[PDB]
Amino acid sequence: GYDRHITIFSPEGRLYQVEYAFKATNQTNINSLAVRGKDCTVVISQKKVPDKLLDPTTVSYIFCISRTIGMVVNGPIPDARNAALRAKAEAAEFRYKYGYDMPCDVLAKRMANLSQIYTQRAYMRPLGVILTFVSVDEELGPSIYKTDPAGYYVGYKATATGPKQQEITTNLENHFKKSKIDHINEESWEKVVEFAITHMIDALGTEFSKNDLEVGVATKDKFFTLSAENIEERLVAIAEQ
Amino acid sequence: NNYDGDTVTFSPTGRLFQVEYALEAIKQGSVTVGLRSNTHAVLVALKRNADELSSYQKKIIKCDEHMGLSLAGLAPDARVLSNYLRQQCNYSSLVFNRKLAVERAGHLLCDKAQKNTQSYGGRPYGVGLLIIGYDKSGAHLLEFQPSGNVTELYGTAIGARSQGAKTYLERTLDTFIKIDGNPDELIKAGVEAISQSLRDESLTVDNLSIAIVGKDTPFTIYDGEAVAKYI
Amino acid sequence: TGYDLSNSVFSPDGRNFQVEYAVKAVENGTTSIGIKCNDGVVFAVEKLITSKLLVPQKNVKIQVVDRHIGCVYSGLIPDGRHLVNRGREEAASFKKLYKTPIPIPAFADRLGQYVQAHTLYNSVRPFGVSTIFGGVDKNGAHLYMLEPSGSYWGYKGAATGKGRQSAKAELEKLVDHHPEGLSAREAVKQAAKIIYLAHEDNKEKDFELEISWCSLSETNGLHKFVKGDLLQEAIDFAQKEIN
Amino acid sequence: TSIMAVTFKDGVILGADSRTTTGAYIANRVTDKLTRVHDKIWCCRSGSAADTQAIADIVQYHLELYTSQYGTPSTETAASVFKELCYENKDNLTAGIIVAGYDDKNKGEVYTIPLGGSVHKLPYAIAGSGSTFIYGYCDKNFRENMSKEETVDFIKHSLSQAIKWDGSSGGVIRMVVLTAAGVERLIFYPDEYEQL
Amino acid sequence: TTIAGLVFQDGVILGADTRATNDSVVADKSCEKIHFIAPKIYCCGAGVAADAEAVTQLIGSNIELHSLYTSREPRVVSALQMLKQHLFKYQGHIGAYLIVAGVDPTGSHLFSIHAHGSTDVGYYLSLGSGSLAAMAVLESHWKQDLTKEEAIKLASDAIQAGIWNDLGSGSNVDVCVMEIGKDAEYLRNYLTPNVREEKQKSYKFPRGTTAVLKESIVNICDIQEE
Amino acid sequence: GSRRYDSRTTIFSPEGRLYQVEYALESISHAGTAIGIMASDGIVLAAERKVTSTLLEQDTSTEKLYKLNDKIAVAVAGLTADAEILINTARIHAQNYLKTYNEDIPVEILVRRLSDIKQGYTQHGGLRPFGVSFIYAGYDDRYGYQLYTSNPSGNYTGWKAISVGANTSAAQTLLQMDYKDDMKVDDAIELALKTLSKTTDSSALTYDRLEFATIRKGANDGEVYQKIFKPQEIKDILVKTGIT
Amino acid sequence: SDPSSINGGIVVAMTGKDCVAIACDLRLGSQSLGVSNKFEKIFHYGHVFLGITGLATDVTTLNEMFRYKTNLYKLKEERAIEPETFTQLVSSSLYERRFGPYFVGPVVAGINSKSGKPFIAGFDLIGCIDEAKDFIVSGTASDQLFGMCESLYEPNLEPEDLFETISQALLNAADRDALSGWGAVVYIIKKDEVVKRYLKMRQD
Amino acid sequence: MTDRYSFSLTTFSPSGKLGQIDYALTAVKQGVTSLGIKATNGVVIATEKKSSSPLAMSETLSKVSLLTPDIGAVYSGMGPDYRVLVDKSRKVAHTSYKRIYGEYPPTKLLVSEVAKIMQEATQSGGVRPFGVSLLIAGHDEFNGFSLYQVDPSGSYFPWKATAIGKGSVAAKTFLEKRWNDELELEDAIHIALLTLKESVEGEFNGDTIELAIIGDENPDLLGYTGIPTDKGPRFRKLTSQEINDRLEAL
Ligand SMILES: *[C@@H](CS(C)(=O)=O)[C@H](Cc1ccc(CN)cc1)NC(=O)[C@H](COC)NC(=O)[C@H](CC(C)C)NC(=O)c1cnc(C)s1
Ligand SMILES: [Cl-]
Ligand SMILES: [Mg+2]
Ligand SMILES: [Mg+2]
Ligand SMILES: [Mg+2]
Ligand SMILES: [Mg+2]
């Protein structure tokens, strides 16, 4: 049964190493969510600092890939950082060669093609991560593109990733069934973050403090992460209505 | 068991069996003793013959004018590692006009041995080395194991029945460390130490091999009638 | 089954058993710790005295990278040395290109990516060490701990090896009892105590304490070993606390 | 070419003419020789246009990749990357670059990198063919901790003279101001600076 | 060669003559010096004709593959960056001098590229042996916010200045107009001011004038079959 | 390391056989039958297509008979994709010889070269062999008309008539029965089709199932013509010989 | 010293009404020494004709190279190459030796078998294409050929008239060049017949 | 940090089977149905956009890809494997053909190059076969319209009409009854939509179906005017609206 150890076909036409890499994705037990506003793309993720000895400022699964692109990872941190460093390198190389900032969807495709190679070539293992890329693209507008260990990628109106992804997904599905639009009709990113947090609270059924969340925001010409105090301001506004 | 086919595989308890099997080749090797004072450092080695017609396999190798080692285990691996030491000692002299520190020599052997334990296709070195030397911080004795672990010591022994000599040195520690400016008495203590590891056989003229380095003494090896004095 | 025989193979769980087996080699090793203080970091390690024949203060375990970073590790000592050799190459090439000495978070990722790379292929073995390291850069003090998987985080206090649970409990008290922070000279004393308390797990053989530190005020932000009177003061403090 | 960077109280200002020549023909009379390698790290280019553009493009790439990993690079770091390229490829390059940048910690800094690939940190720097004519003027008139208006006048008067005497220099005087406030572009036309 | 490019209200326009020369002789009287890169990105070429042709074709091929890969309209800065990095690599040994212009989602752009790998940004540019004749016209008459009708006039006038006054340049005028939100219109033989006049005589010979030693039929087909 | 997963394609069995060559030959024994017959005035190549579907575009299809140059053709039995790799190599070898010597490559030299490539995959490199057997039909001015076969082992031999692929045992018996040395192309055409008609696993032999070719020194004025038969022409020769 | 003028020789091609003509001299020399009077410079690959002037070793090498490439083209494409496509293949192959070029002056001539359109083209030594409507010249007497063609030529000549025009263009150009002459060949090419004629000329 | 897989991972088993090719074909069988039909004046290729989530924007995932202006491709099997083959197919069309001959390759030769890449993954060291079957439709001047299937083995066959993937056996029977040599392109599109409805479970509209044609030249899609010989791409992807129009006359 060595068809389960390396990336070759089983008799069913399956790649078990790819399937087991998908399971490694949930090893962190963290749920992420991404949504789009009019002018922005917001990504939120659970933050869990179990050890008191940890420096909580260094515990993060959201990465600034380029000025315009942000990336949240669902999976173990070593593979997450492997993917982060490569995406940064690819984004920088793209800008140098072709003279404009790498689009979110093109980076996603590039990382997905790299992931595909690990599913076809035996000596390289798949990375046990799902990469969610976010930006406000200068041609396509607010953008969410997600990559997995199979090398699959696709654009999203909104998305969720993690152990409880199905609960978050159905919550978001039901909202967009009502509104009948592809985005959160809201002017400020602050209110789109409030939407994102609110709908994660409803879906997961848990309350959050400022240290339980981690937020990334993409606007035109920059992606940035919110501090604990910026999130606290968001949590106060949610509670007050 | 299933995890001893190659050096690249950890066992479920975190062990490297190929390295441990290389360690076993040293225990099968003939005994050799190392010890030092503040002025001198001495190697004493029991050489092994194949039969009565054969010569006794040489155990001590010179690396530089101020450094050398004794071996126990696979002699070709000692030749590779001693040649590497010769080159590193030589590089230090040619480029920096500097005699290589014994501590730094140990670090280099450690790192050379380590590379063979982490990569596929290679095997660990099958030999243990006792490096003596006299450098800018005085006399030194090192013990090299092919796991990579190198250890600075006052005295030690490696090879078959080496635990007898190692216990003697552990008792004698306070005496032999004080043997300063007296090479013959330091060798005597080394010859008396290696005698604790003998069974059935005794120290004859072509059996015994001694080496010494010190303050105003280059690394020199004594074999044959040159060691009859100490029998 | 057979998923644990080769490195870089995912088990049906989504685990790399060879990396988990490297962790067992780390758990088998001697205790090492790190303490983040007000303007720096303190590193300490347990050195088991196997025999009277070991020369005191000579078999140095803590290693410097560049001039501002200290590294200590538990597990397979040669694997730790190999990792520090790489770290030195990374720190050298960073300084060569960018002039400034390598920042600690930057340095942490350099080791992190290199260790992680040794979980990607079956032709290599994972590292059999957890490495505690850190120092002072332009943004202040940083302490990190790096596992065989490539995983690393920033720490207030860190501990690894056979006495890690004992040490971790002691570090957790210091964090609770000193929220405003701990001084560099205090951290040296506390580090000595924690190694002495953690020695109950390795209580058969007696041991030798080794401490180092980087501190902006006490060492000008450079890595130095604690020696002589300051070391003896820390040993005396530690000996007083166990009795 | 006449280029200069001048530190002052609030930060640093880069200044340049706009003339590019192929022999005695002016290939471009409105050239922008003040080029951005980072938000608040700019450089003035002199020598082979191909070489300095090729270098500046590589530096911009390196500092972009530095920023993604380690945050905002220092001006010293930028000058080091320029130096590394210039020094290691000295046999195949004709580049004379002034690097100028603003940190909040270090404030305004200026580094000059002449042909050899050496680095020199200075209060102000002048370079290009037209700089020879204003060594005397700039030495006599430069003061440390000038105001923004004084530094703009110092650069304007200086490059005015460089332009007047050097045939290789001319056109508009472009300037780029680097302070905590941000990045300001200034332009000054012949009818303004010639009558000074 | 006389090539030029200039910008107008909502576009960019390129112009070129149609003469190719080998030393003092005219190799080609109707050559296309405005090279195609993408549907809305064009390139005027001067210098070594083979080099200008080959480098535009190569970058055009890579731009097409890039456009397919990214699912986006190609940008003029991408062509610019790829051309300059290629030309720089070869240290001027690829002796191509180019004016690149086009329209993309960013807007309209106009650049010049030299054989050694230097680039310029401009509102009006000219290259080749007739650049000085063309630039004289562009400096006299160019203004901001030109209409398309004025821009075609000015571009063709600049090229004509080269045709008449430069020996390196001659024959016809080719133009390409790239306007925002519209298909690029490529206008080969836009002007034809140098048609050859009718000859005085016909030099058609009486048949049999040439002495012949042998005749034969050449078999060009595959296998004459049974 | 990687050793664990290595099949070891280039080793002897205890009996002194090459495992992978033998198993490749087993693969080839299931492929559609190809027959070559050599006459005094030409060579016939006949071959049976494997995938009868009504929707297969037959006139633009080529799975069996390939052209190597103007004088040499091959019939394929085995993996078509593997054969195409080798065919393109053989096409290049022929043009290299023509460039070097300014003469068309002799048939045996081309055959040996391909056979040597196949041999290499059985002795070194750790890769699987090519699952292909060729029948080479060719002409040159030294030996005239020649038929050869090569198999995955890289061994090649010359023939007067030969089959490869499915039912070769049955096919070779029928050819051995009805072949004669003074035979002509028209007779060999009939023999090739009759042999396929009897050995075929199908219910009946039809035009849509066959690829057919002749090399004749019966072109205009003593040249050699390669004729790859069109579907309608295969249909005509089936009616002429009296099979349909 | 100049490789393109060691051996000498010329090629000229012209278009006519539903036809093309390509012609060449027969000389091969070592500078002043005449060596061969049978060195033809026109080759054909199916119905596409290629003339090549310049360094004779490269003329022979390129002929062998394009025979190679057009043979493989035909096996893969299952049709003969057309003049327009072949022109691009010549350009490609020349330019890939950009910095160590073949010292040649190729000339393509032929009729597209599908459209019936007459086609000629010329190249410099590194592959820049000159696709003329009227005529193409090449070789050591290219200046002389330009002068003859430019005055003698008129468009839409019938095959047997075009023969006279191209022949007189070649012969009179060759007689003003020391390194050309020693015989001449003219190909008259129509859609499905090609006539080859050897010309009588002065043998100095 | 070595690639030690220099040996074949696809080998012959005792029965003569190449296991990994057979298993790749099994992966193709599990994949969503796609089909191709050839008319007299065109070719049509079609497949179902099986959306993995309703939050996903299925427009961004292109199952039907342009390879050259006159050649298109569709697949059944593993999508990531298809995506990288399309990248390599587009590039090989330039490097091994357009940069040599100054024109795009004919359908059969581009197919041959794709086939070659797939064959090499079936024999080279340390790789598995591609888990896709491709259907490649195209036009060129001398061969006219054509439709090819390409399998994981590297084998390719020309078809008048065919289907691959999930419901291919039923679909091929449906196409045998309906196909004739006098079909116009509109008739083939109509048959394609009928055939594809049988294998689709859920919604059946322009948003859940992807369909492209190789037909007449589209000078409107070219992007420029002024060269009479360049008349525009024969490949055209039908819009969501254009599909729905033909579903009313169904
Ligand atoms: C004008 C360039 S100038 C006089 O330097 O301003 C034109 C530009 C040009 C660009 C593209 C094309 C065709 N796509 C044609 C023309 N260039 C030329 O006239 C050049 C010479 O400029 C110095 N002509 C050539 O390079 C000719 C080839 C043409 C006759 C087809 N080649 C050569 O003269 C030689 C090349 N190598 C030699 C040795 S000689
Ligand atoms: Cl890619
Ligand atoms: Mg793999
Ligand atoms: Mg001036
Ligand atoms: Mg003459
Ligand atoms: Mg003469």
Coordinates of C-alpha atoms in Angstrom, one line a residue, chain F residues 36-236:
Chain F
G36 CA 4.1 -7.2 -43.1
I37 CA 4.7 -9.3 -46.3
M38 CA 7.6 -8.8 -48.6
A39 CA 7.4 -9.6 -52.4
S40 CA 9.8 -9.5 -55.3
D41 CA 8.3 -6.2 -56.6
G42 CA 7.2 -4.6 -53.3
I43 CA 6.1 -4.8 -49.7
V44 CA 2.6 -4.8 -48.1
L45 CA 1.8 -3.5 -44.7
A46 CA -1.6 -4.4 -43.3
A47 CA -2.9 -3.6 -39.8
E48 CA -6.1 -3.9 -37.7
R49 CA -7.4 -0.9 -35.8
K50 CA -8.5 -1.7 -32.2
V51 CA -11.3 0.7 -31.3
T52 CA -14.3 0.2 -33.6
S53 CA -16.7 3.2 -33.0
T54 CA -19.0 4.6 -35.8
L55 CA -18.1 8.1 -34.6
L56 CA -14.3 7.8 -35.1
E57 CA -13.1 10.0 -37.9
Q58 CA -11.2 7.4 -39.9
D59 CA -9.9 9.4 -42.9
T60 CA -7.9 11.8 -40.7
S61 CA -6.9 8.9 -38.2
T62 CA -3.5 7.2 -37.9
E63 CA -2.8 4.7 -35.1
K64 CA -1.0 1.9 -36.9
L65 CA 0.9 3.0 -40.1
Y66 CA 3.4 5.8 -40.0
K67 CA 5.8 7.3 -42.6
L68 CA 9.5 7.5 -41.5
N69 CA 10.8 8.9 -44.8
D70 CA 10.0 8.5 -48.5
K71 CA 11.5 5.0 -48.6
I72 CA 10.7 3.6 -45.2
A73 CA 7.4 3.1 -43.2
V74 CA 6.4 1.3 -40.0
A75 CA 3.4 -0.6 -38.6
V76 CA 2.9 -0.2 -34.9
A77 CA 1.7 -2.7 -32.2
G78 CA 1.4 -1.5 -28.6
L79 CA 1.1 1.9 -26.9
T80 CA 0.6 4.5 -29.7
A81 CA 2.0 7.4 -27.6
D82 CA 5.2 5.4 -27.0
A83 CA 5.5 4.6 -30.7
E84 CA 5.2 8.3 -31.6
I85 CA 8.2 9.2 -29.4
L86 CA 10.3 6.6 -31.2
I87 CA 8.9 7.5 -34.7
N88 CA 10.0 11.2 -34.3
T89 CA 13.4 10.0 -33.3
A90 CA 13.7 7.7 -36.3
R91 CA 12.5 10.6 -38.5
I92 CA 15.3 12.8 -37.2
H93 CA 17.9 10.0 -37.5
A94 CA 17.0 9.6 -41.2
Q95 CA 17.4 13.3 -41.9
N96 CA 20.7 13.4 -40.0
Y97 CA 22.0 10.7 -42.2
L98 CA 20.7 12.5 -45.3
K99 CA 22.4 15.7 -44.2
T100 CA 25.7 14.0 -43.4
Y101 CA 26.1 11.7 -46.4
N102 CA 23.7 13.2 -49.0
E103 CA 22.2 9.7 -49.4
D104 CA 18.9 8.2 -48.1
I105 CA 19.5 6.2 -44.9
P106 CA 19.8 2.4 -45.5
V107 CA 16.9 0.5 -43.9
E108 CA 19.0 -1.6 -41.5
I109 CA 20.9 1.4 -40.1
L110 CA 17.7 3.2 -39.2
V111 CA 16.3 -0.1 -37.6
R112 CA 19.5 -0.7 -35.6
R113 CA 19.4 2.9 -34.2
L114 CA 15.8 2.6 -32.9
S115 CA 16.5 -0.9 -31.6
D116 CA 19.6 0.5 -29.7
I117 CA 17.4 3.2 -28.1
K118 CA 14.9 0.5 -26.9
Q119 CA 17.9 -1.6 -25.6
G120 CA 19.1 1.3 -23.5
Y121 CA 15.9 1.5 -21.6
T122 CA 16.3 -2.2 -20.6
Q123 CA 19.9 -1.9 -19.4
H124 CA 20.1 1.6 -17.7
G125 CA 18.2 4.6 -16.4
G126 CA 15.6 2.9 -14.2
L127 CA 12.8 3.8 -16.6
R128 CA 10.1 1.5 -18.0
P129 CA 10.8 0.2 -21.6
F130 CA 8.7 1.3 -24.6
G131 CA 5.7 -0.9 -24.9
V132 CA 6.0 -1.0 -28.7
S133 CA 6.8 -3.5 -31.5
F134 CA 7.5 -2.2 -35.0
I135 CA 7.3 -3.8 -38.4
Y136 CA 9.7 -1.8 -40.6
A137 CA 8.9 -1.9 -44.4
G138 CA 11.6 -0.2 -46.5
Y139 CA 13.7 0.0 -49.6
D140 CA 17.3 0.9 -50.4
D141 CA 19.7 0.3 -53.3
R142 CA 21.9 -2.2 -51.4
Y143 CA 19.4 -4.9 -50.3
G144 CA 16.3 -3.8 -52.1
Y145 CA 13.0 -4.5 -50.3
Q146 CA 13.4 -5.3 -46.6
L147 CA 11.1 -6.2 -43.7
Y148 CA 12.2 -6.0 -40.1
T149 CA 10.7 -6.2 -36.6
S150 CA 11.9 -4.7 -33.3
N151 CA 10.4 -5.3 -29.9
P152 CA 10.9 -3.7 -26.4
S153 CA 14.1 -5.8 -25.8
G154 CA 15.8 -3.9 -28.6
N155 CA 16.3 -7.1 -30.5
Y156 CA 15.5 -6.9 -34.3
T157 CA 15.3 -9.5 -37.1
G158 CA 14.6 -9.6 -40.8
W159 CA 11.6 -11.3 -42.4
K160 CA 10.0 -12.3 -45.7
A161 CA 6.6 -12.2 -43.9
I162 CA 5.8 -11.4 -40.3
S163 CA 3.1 -10.4 -37.8
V164 CA 3.1 -8.5 -34.5
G165 CA 0.5 -7.8 -31.9
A166 CA -2.5 -10.1 -31.3
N167 CA -2.8 -13.7 -32.5
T168 CA 0.8 -13.8 -34.0
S169 CA 1.1 -17.6 -33.4
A170 CA -2.0 -18.2 -35.5
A171 CA -1.1 -15.5 -38.0
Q172 CA 2.5 -16.8 -38.5
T173 CA 1.2 -20.3 -39.2
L174 CA -1.1 -19.1 -41.9
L175 CA 1.6 -16.9 -43.6
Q176 CA 4.1 -19.8 -43.4
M177 CA 1.5 -22.0 -45.2
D178 CA 0.7 -19.7 -48.1
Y179 CA 3.8 -17.6 -48.7
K180 CA 6.2 -18.4 -51.6
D181 CA 9.4 -16.6 -52.7
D182 CA 8.4 -15.8 -56.2
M183 CA 5.2 -14.0 -54.9
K184 CA 4.0 -10.6 -56.2
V185 CA 2.6 -7.5 -54.5
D186 CA -1.0 -8.1 -55.6
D187 CA -0.8 -11.7 -54.2
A188 CA 0.8 -10.5 -51.0
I189 CA -2.0 -7.9 -50.6
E190 CA -4.5 -10.8 -50.8
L191 CA -2.5 -12.9 -48.3
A192 CA -2.2 -10.1 -45.8
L193 CA -6.0 -9.4 -45.8
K194 CA -6.9 -13.1 -45.8
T195 CA -4.7 -13.7 -42.7
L196 CA -6.2 -10.8 -40.8
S197 CA -9.7 -12.0 -41.8
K198 CA -9.1 -15.4 -40.1
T199 CA -7.1 -14.2 -37.0
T200 CA -9.3 -11.2 -36.2
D201 CA -11.2 -11.3 -32.9
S202 CA -14.0 -9.3 -34.6
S203 CA -17.1 -10.8 -36.3
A204 CA -16.1 -9.5 -39.7
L205 CA -13.2 -7.6 -41.3
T206 CA -14.4 -4.2 -42.7
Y207 CA -12.7 -1.1 -44.3
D208 CA -13.3 1.2 -41.2
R209 CA -11.2 -1.2 -39.2
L210 CA -8.1 -1.4 -41.3
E211 CA -5.0 0.6 -42.1
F212 CA -3.2 -0.6 -45.3
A213 CA -0.1 0.4 -47.1
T214 CA 2.2 -0.6 -50.0
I215 CA 5.8 0.2 -50.9
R216 CA 6.2 -0.5 -54.7
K217 CA 9.1 -0.1 -57.1
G218 CA 6.3 0.4 -59.6
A219 CA 6.3 4.1 -59.7
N220 CA 6.9 6.0 -63.0
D221 CA 10.4 5.4 -64.4
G222 CA 12.0 3.1 -61.7
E223 CA 11.3 5.1 -58.4
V224 CA 9.8 3.8 -55.2
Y225 CA 6.3 4.9 -54.1
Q226 CA 4.8 4.7 -50.6
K227 CA 1.0 4.4 -50.7
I228 CA -1.0 4.8 -47.5
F229 CA -4.5 3.6 -48.5
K230 CA -7.5 5.9 -48.0
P231 CA -10.7 4.4 -46.5
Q232 CA -12.4 4.1 -49.8
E233 CA -9.4 2.4 -51.3
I234 CA -9.3 -0.2 -48.5
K235 CA -13.0 -0.7 -49.2
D236 CA -12.2 -1.3 -52.9

